[PDB]
Amino acid sequence: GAMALKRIHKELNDLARDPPAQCSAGPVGDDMFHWQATAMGPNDSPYQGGVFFLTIHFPTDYPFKPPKVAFTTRIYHPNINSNGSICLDILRSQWSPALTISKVLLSICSLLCDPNPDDPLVPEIARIYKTDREKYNRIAREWTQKYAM
């Protein structure tokens, strides 16, 4: 409804004035409830140099339920699967209406920087992140080259 639209317009205005990261985000054409985003791979992470696209869908009762957020660029990460689904607490149980799309993107960039291997969406990637960090970084760099450049 109208409260949601008003909140989404406010968050868009704020994001243009103070972008989170390295990120961009905003509506796909005239649809205020479906956005595209991009995130740069953080410097000093294995994703450095990549650009990663995301899709965002705001629910009709925003801001009192979370937006749906998924990657459309492939990425090698313990908490992001081959469908681009993201395991991130604030997109589920830990949502609050005090969060905004800018805060969500900051949290997703932090997650790229520092995974949660105890919440393994991709069990093997979570495993190697723990047991062989250098091998994880190497494969994540390789996938950045393959998919995100």
Side-chain angles (χ1 to χ4, degrees), residues 106-143:
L106 289 177
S107 291
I108 290 169
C109 292
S110 186
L111 187 68
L112 298 189
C113 296
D114 205 352
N116 296 306
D118 290 335
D119 280 320
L121 267 187
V122 189
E124 172 59 17
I125 308 182
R127 179 188 162 88
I128 63 158
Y129 181 81
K130 297 183 179 168
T131 57
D132 192 354
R133 184 67 56 77
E134 303 190 59
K135 186 180 304 303
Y136 165 84
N137 282 343
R138 180 170 34 257
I139 305 160
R141 284 188 243 108
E142 289 176 13
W143 280 43

Side-chain angles (χ1 to χ4, degrees), residues 60-113:
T60 62
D61 47 6
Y62 195 73
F64 293 94
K65 294 201 214 279
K68 286 182 173 209
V69 187
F71 279 74
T72 57
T73 301
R74 295 182 61 176
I75 184 167
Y76 187 80
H77 190 282
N79 308 115
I80 302 163
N81 72 13
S82 69
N83 290 329
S85 302
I86 303 166
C87 184
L88 179 58
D89 57 352
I90 58 150
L91 296 175
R92 260 225 227 178
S93 57
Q94 298 291 311
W95 179 256
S96 159
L99 301 180
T100 59
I101 286 301
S102 286
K103 293 172 178 190
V104 168
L105 291 167
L106 289 177
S107 291
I108 290 169
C109 292
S110 186
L111 187 68
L112 298 189
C113 296

